[PDB]
Amino acid sequence: STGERGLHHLIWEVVDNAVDEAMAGFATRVDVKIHADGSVEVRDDGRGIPVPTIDVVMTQVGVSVVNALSTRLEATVLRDGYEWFQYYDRSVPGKLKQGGETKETGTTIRFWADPEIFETTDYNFETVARRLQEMAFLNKGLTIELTDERDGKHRVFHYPG
Ligand SMILES: Cc1ccc(-c2cnc(Nc3ccc(OCCCN4CCN(C)CC4)cc3)c(C(N)=O)n2)cc1C
Ligand code: NA
């Protein structure tokens, strides 16, 4: 889908994955940031995406609609004592970069939806908030924070168990 609905679906797919970590009791929070550069960042404190050829978990990111319909995608993993960077340039992956040391675990997915593919690229804060309100309500005790850098709109979603 190439409209505002299909654009918002890119957010739904990234968030559904982060929320799966929470359901499973690995993640406690999800942070969604709508940037001023056209990108969306989804951060969780889960296990970190692991760093046949179709046994490589990162391949699920590479083959996804989010990576296909994005000019750029940045996957940042905090796992196995290190920070890891797996970047894609127009769906094409770069080499896996091993950064600094960390005791933390988690996944950050940042994607720039293709302005040629979508005739809008303008996310709707209310639509995102509607989806994120459902994510927190289905996962009682999970904290979800939504921030929009474009206008300073901020919301916290938490339902106490
Ligand atoms: C667009 C998109 C974005 C994120 C993800 C994604 C995938 N896996 C994830 N999580 C995840 C974490 C741990 C994990 O471990 C699986 C068990 C251990 N592996 C067994 C196979 N081995 C080769 C490696 C280790 C699998 C998935 C997460 C996330 N946000 O946590 N996101 C998927 C898609 C399609
Ligand atoms: Na964690």
Side-chain angles (χ1 to χ4, degrees), residues 21-37:
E21 284 300 285
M23 299 180 79
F26 304 123
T28 70
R29 69 177 301 117
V30 181
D31 293 276
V32 187
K33 170 108 72 187
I34 299 167
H35 292 274
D37 65 356

PDB file of all heavy atoms in Angstrom, residues 21-37:
ATOM      1  N   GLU A  21       8.544  -8.714  21.895  1.00  0.00           N
ATOM      2  CA  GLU A  21       9.573  -8.819  22.937  1.00  0.00           C
ATOM      3  C   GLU A  21       8.987  -8.528  24.309  1.00  0.00           C
ATOM      4  O   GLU A  21       9.435  -9.098  25.298  1.00  0.00           O
ATOM      5  CB  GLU A  21      10.709  -7.802  22.676  1.00  0.00           C
ATOM      6  CG  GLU A  21      11.657  -8.198  21.568  1.00  0.00           C
ATOM      7  CD  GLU A  21      12.391  -9.503  21.794  1.00  0.00           C
ATOM      8  OE1 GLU A  21      13.336  -9.518  22.612  1.00  0.00           O
ATOM      9  OE2 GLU A  21      11.994 -10.521  21.182  1.00  0.00           O
ATOM     10  N   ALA A  22       8.029  -7.594  24.379  1.00  0.00           N
ATOM     11  CA  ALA A  22       7.354  -7.214  25.612  1.00  0.00           C
ATOM     12  C   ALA A  22       6.377  -8.313  26.074  1.00  0.00           C
ATOM     13  O   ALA A  22       6.397  -8.669  27.259  1.00  0.00           O
ATOM     14  CB  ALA A  22       6.641  -5.886  25.435  1.00  0.00           C
ATOM     15  N   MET A  23       5.558  -8.869  25.136  1.00  0.00           N
ATOM     16  CA  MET A  23       4.576  -9.945  25.373  1.00  0.00           C
ATOM     17  C   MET A  23       5.283 -11.147  26.035  1.00  0.00           C
ATOM     18  O   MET A  23       4.748 -11.765  26.959  1.00  0.00           O
ATOM     19  CB  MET A  23       3.920 -10.443  24.046  1.00  0.00           C
ATOM     20  CG  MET A  23       3.130  -9.394  23.249  1.00  0.00           C
ATOM     21  SD  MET A  23       2.360 -10.016  21.698  1.00  0.00           S
ATOM     22  CE  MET A  23       0.926 -10.849  22.370  1.00  0.00           C
ATOM     23  N   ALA A  24       6.493 -11.445  25.533  1.00  0.00           N
ATOM     24  CA  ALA A  24       7.389 -12.527  25.918  1.00  0.00           C
ATOM     25  C   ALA A  24       8.174 -12.207  27.204  1.00  0.00           C
ATOM     26  O   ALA A  24       8.891 -13.065  27.711  1.00  0.00           O
ATOM     27  CB  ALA A  24       8.335 -12.840  24.760  1.00  0.00           C
ATOM     28  N   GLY A  25       7.976 -11.000  27.742  1.00  0.00           N
ATOM     29  CA  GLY A  25       8.568 -10.559  29.002  1.00  0.00           C
ATOM     30  C   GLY A  25      10.034 -10.204  28.937  1.00  0.00           C
ATOM     31  O   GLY A  25      10.715 -10.266  29.961  1.00  0.00           O
ATOM     32  N   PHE A  26      10.534  -9.841  27.742  1.00  0.00           N
ATOM     33  CA  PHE A  26      11.950  -9.464  27.542  1.00  0.00           C
ATOM     34  C   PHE A  26      12.108  -7.952  27.575  1.00  0.00           C
ATOM     35  O   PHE A  26      13.039  -7.472  28.196  1.00  0.00           O
ATOM     36  CB  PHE A  26      12.561 -10.074  26.232  1.00  0.00           C
ATOM     37  CG  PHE A  26      12.461 -11.584  26.143  1.00  0.00           C
ATOM     38  CD1 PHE A  26      11.825 -12.191  25.067  1.00  0.00           C
ATOM     39  CD2 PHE A  26      12.970 -12.399  27.160  1.00  0.00           C
ATOM     40  CE1 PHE A  26      11.712 -13.589  24.998  1.00  0.00           C
ATOM     41  CE2 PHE A  26      12.846 -13.795  27.095  1.00  0.00           C
ATOM     42  CZ  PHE A  26      12.201 -14.382  26.022  1.00  0.00           C
ATOM     43  N   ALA A  27      11.198  -7.208  26.922  1.00  0.00           N
ATOM     44  CA  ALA A  27      11.208  -5.733  26.871  1.00  0.00           C
ATOM     45  C   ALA A  27      10.208  -5.163  27.883  1.00  0.00           C
ATOM     46  O   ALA A  27       9.178  -5.782  28.157  1.00  0.00           O
ATOM     47  CB  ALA A  27      10.855  -5.250  25.466  1.00  0.00           C
ATOM     48  N   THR A  28      10.504  -3.986  28.426  1.00  0.00           N
ATOM     49  CA  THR A  28       9.641  -3.310  29.407  1.00  0.00           C
ATOM     50  C   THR A  28       9.111  -1.993  28.837  1.00  0.00           C
ATOM     51  O   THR A  28       8.168  -1.437  29.370  1.00  0.00           O
ATOM     52  CB  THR A  28      10.399  -3.054  30.727  1.00  0.00           C
ATOM     53  OG1 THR A  28      11.400  -2.035  30.549  1.00  0.00           O
ATOM     54  CG2 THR A  28      11.000  -4.338  31.335  1.00  0.00           C
ATOM     55  N   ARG A  29       9.748  -1.475  27.784  1.00  0.00           N
ATOM     56  CA  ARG A  29       9.384  -0.197  27.185  1.00  0.00           C
ATOM     57  C   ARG A  29       9.614  -0.110  25.695  1.00  0.00           C
ATOM     58  O   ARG A  29      10.492  -0.800  25.146  1.00  0.00           O
ATOM     59  CB  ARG A  29      10.014   1.002  27.931  1.00  0.00           C
ATOM     60  CG  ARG A  29      11.518   1.139  27.817  1.00  0.00           C
ATOM     61  CD  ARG A  29      12.014   2.394  28.520  1.00  0.00           C
ATOM     62  NE  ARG A  29      11.414   3.621  27.981  1.00  0.00           N
ATOM     63  CZ  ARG A  29      10.628   4.460  28.660  1.00  0.00           C
ATOM     64  NH1 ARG A  29      10.363   4.244  29.946  1.00  0.00           N
ATOM     65  NH2 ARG A  29      10.128   5.534  28.067  1.00  0.00           N
ATOM     66  N   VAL A  30       8.775   0.703  25.023  1.00  0.00           N
ATOM     67  CA  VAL A  30       8.937   0.946  23.597  1.00  0.00           C
ATOM     68  C   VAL A  30       8.951   2.452  23.393  1.00  0.00           C
ATOM     69  O   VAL A  30       8.097   3.155  23.928  1.00  0.00           O
ATOM     70  CB  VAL A  30       7.933   0.194  22.660  1.00  0.00           C
ATOM     71  CG1 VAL A  30       8.213   0.504  21.193  1.00  0.00           C
ATOM     72  CG2 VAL A  30       7.962  -1.322  22.895  1.00  0.00           C
ATOM     73  N   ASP A  31       9.946   2.959  22.683  1.00  0.00           N
ATOM     74  CA  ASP A  31      10.023   4.392  22.392  1.00  0.00           C
ATOM     75  C   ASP A  31       9.854   4.561  20.911  1.00  0.00           C
ATOM     76  O   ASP A  31      10.501   3.850  20.146  1.00  0.00           O
ATOM     77  CB  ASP A  31      11.340   5.018  22.902  1.00  0.00           C
ATOM     78  CG  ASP A  31      11.427   5.028  24.414  1.00  0.00           C
ATOM     79  OD1 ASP A  31      10.872   5.966  25.036  1.00  0.00           O
ATOM     80  OD2 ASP A  31      11.999   4.077  24.979  1.00  0.00           O
ATOM     81  N   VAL A  32       8.911   5.435  20.498  1.00  0.00           N
ATOM     82  CA  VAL A  32       8.621   5.754  19.092  1.00  0.00           C
ATOM     83  C   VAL A  32       8.880   7.256  18.901  1.00  0.00           C
ATOM     84  O   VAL A  32       8.279   8.099  19.586  1.00  0.00           O
ATOM     85  CB  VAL A  32       7.198   5.344  18.639  1.00  0.00           C
ATOM     86  CG1 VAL A  32       7.020   5.551  17.130  1.00  0.00           C
ATOM     87  CG2 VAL A  32       6.875   3.895  19.032  1.00  0.00           C
ATOM     88  N   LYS A  33       9.817   7.583  18.003  1.00  0.00           N
ATOM     89  CA  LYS A  33      10.159   8.962  17.734  1.00  0.00           C
ATOM     90  C   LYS A  33       9.924   9.245  16.273  1.00  0.00           C
ATOM     91  O   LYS A  33      10.471   8.547  15.418  1.00  0.00           O
ATOM     92  CB  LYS A  33      11.607   9.253  18.175  1.00  0.00           C
ATOM     93  CG  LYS A  33      12.190  10.602  17.731  1.00  0.00           C
ATOM     94  CD  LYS A  33      12.340  11.624  18.857  1.00  0.00           C
ATOM     95  CE  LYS A  33      13.452  11.317  19.826  1.00  0.00           C
ATOM     96  NZ  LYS A  33      13.428  12.250  20.990  1.00  0.00           N
ATOM     97  N   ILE A  34       9.060  10.232  15.989  1.00  0.00           N
ATOM     98  CA  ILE A  34       8.778  10.697  14.624  1.00  0.00           C
ATOM     99  C   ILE A  34       9.758  11.871  14.446  1.00  0.00           C
ATOM    100  O   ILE A  34       9.589  12.898  15.098  1.00  0.00           O
ATOM    101  CB  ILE A  34       7.291  11.136  14.411  1.00  0.00           C
ATOM    102  CG1 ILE A  34       6.299   9.971  14.666  1.00  0.00           C
ATOM    103  CG2 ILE A  34       7.102  11.744  13.004  1.00  0.00           C
ATOM    104  CD1 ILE A  34       4.743  10.387  14.800  1.00  0.00           C
ATOM    105  N   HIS A  35      10.799  11.695  13.610  1.00  0.00           N
ATOM    106  CA  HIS A  35      11.840  12.724  13.413  1.00  0.00           C
ATOM    107  C   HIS A  35      11.468  13.826  12.421  1.00  0.00           C
ATOM    108  O   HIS A  35      10.522  13.670  11.654  1.00  0.00           O
ATOM    109  CB  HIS A  35      13.170  12.085  13.020  1.00  0.00           C
ATOM    110  CG  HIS A  35      13.820  11.282  14.097  1.00  0.00           C
ATOM    111  ND1 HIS A  35      14.648  11.868  15.035  1.00  0.00           N
ATOM    112  CD2 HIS A  35      13.810   9.945  14.300  1.00  0.00           C
ATOM    113  CE1 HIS A  35      15.067  10.883  15.812  1.00  0.00           C
ATOM    114  NE2 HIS A  35      14.601   9.706  15.400  1.00  0.00           N
ATOM    115  N   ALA A  36      12.228  14.943  12.436  1.00  0.00           N
ATOM    116  CA  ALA A  36      12.031  16.076  11.526  1.00  0.00           C
ATOM    117  C   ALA A  36      12.607  15.787  10.121  1.00  0.00           C
ATOM    118  O   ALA A  36      12.315  16.523   9.175  1.00  0.00           O
ATOM    119  CB  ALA A  36      12.670  17.316  12.107  1.00  0.00           C
ATOM    120  N   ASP A  37      13.386  14.687   9.981  1.00  0.00           N
ATOM    121  CA  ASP A  37      14.042  14.271   8.728  1.00  0.00           C
ATOM    122  C   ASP A  37      13.214  13.277   7.870  1.00  0.00           C
ATOM    123  O   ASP A  37      13.671  12.879   6.801  1.00  0.00           O
ATOM    124  CB  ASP A  37      15.441  13.702   9.030  1.00  0.00           C
ATOM    125  CG  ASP A  37      15.454  12.415   9.844  1.00  0.00           C
ATOM    126  OD1 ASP A  37      14.371  11.966  10.267  1.00  0.00           O
ATOM    127  OD2 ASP A  37      16.553  11.855  10.050  1.00  0.00           O
TER     128      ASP A  37
END
